[PDB]
Amino acid sequence: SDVLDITADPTTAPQTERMMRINWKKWWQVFYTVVDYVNQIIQLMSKRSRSLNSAAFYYRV
């Protein structure tokens, strides 16, 4: 497919190892996503100077 775009797909390995690694990467990716999410709030904090009511949205509800 394409000009050598797909020339490394047939690893032909129906093994639980790689599959479980994908399962682990799914958790691992969202684990850094939840961090990035909070990090984004910290970026928002810069555009929304004085984010006391924002960060403490818990008590705001």
From Swiss-Prot:
* Shown segment, full-protein numbering: 266 to 326 of 326
What is the stated purpose of this protein? Calcium-binding protein that interacts with rotavirus cell receptors once the initial attachment by VP4 has been achieved. Rotavirus attachment and entry into the host cell probably involves multiple sequential contacts between the outer capsid proteins VP4 and VP7, and the cell receptors. Following entry into the host cell, low intracellular or intravesicular Ca(2+) concentration probably causes the calcium-stabilized VP7 trimers to dissociate from the virion. This step is probably necessary for the membrane-disrupting entry step and the release of VP4, which is locked onto the virion by VP7.
Query: What does the UniProt record tell us about how this protein is modified after translation?
Result: N-glycosylated. The N-terminus is blocked possibly by pyroglutamic acid.
The similarity comment for this entry is: Belongs to the rotavirus VP7 family.
Q: Which domain of life is it from?
A: Viruses
Q: What else is known?
A: Some rotavirus strains are neuraminidase-sensitive and require sialic acid to attach to the cell surface. Some rotavirus strains are integrin-dependent. Some rotavirus strains depend on ganglioside for their entry into the host cell. Hsp70 also seems to be involved in the entry of some strains. In group A rotaviruses, VP7 defines the G serotype.
Subcellular localization: Virion; Host endoplasmic reticulum lumen
Q: Which organism is this protein's natural source?
A: Rotavirus A (isolate RVA/Human/Belgium/B4106/2000/G3P11[14])
Its taxonomic path starts at: Viruses, Riboviria, Orthornavirae, Duplornaviricota, Resentoviricetes
What does the subunit comment say?
Homotrimer; disulfide-linked. 2 Ca(2+) ions bound at each subunit interface in the trimer hold the trimer together. Interacts with the intermediate capsid protein VP6. Interacts with the outer capsid protein VP5*.
Give binding positions for Ca(2+) 2: 36
Name this polypeptide is given: Outer capsid glycoprotein VP7
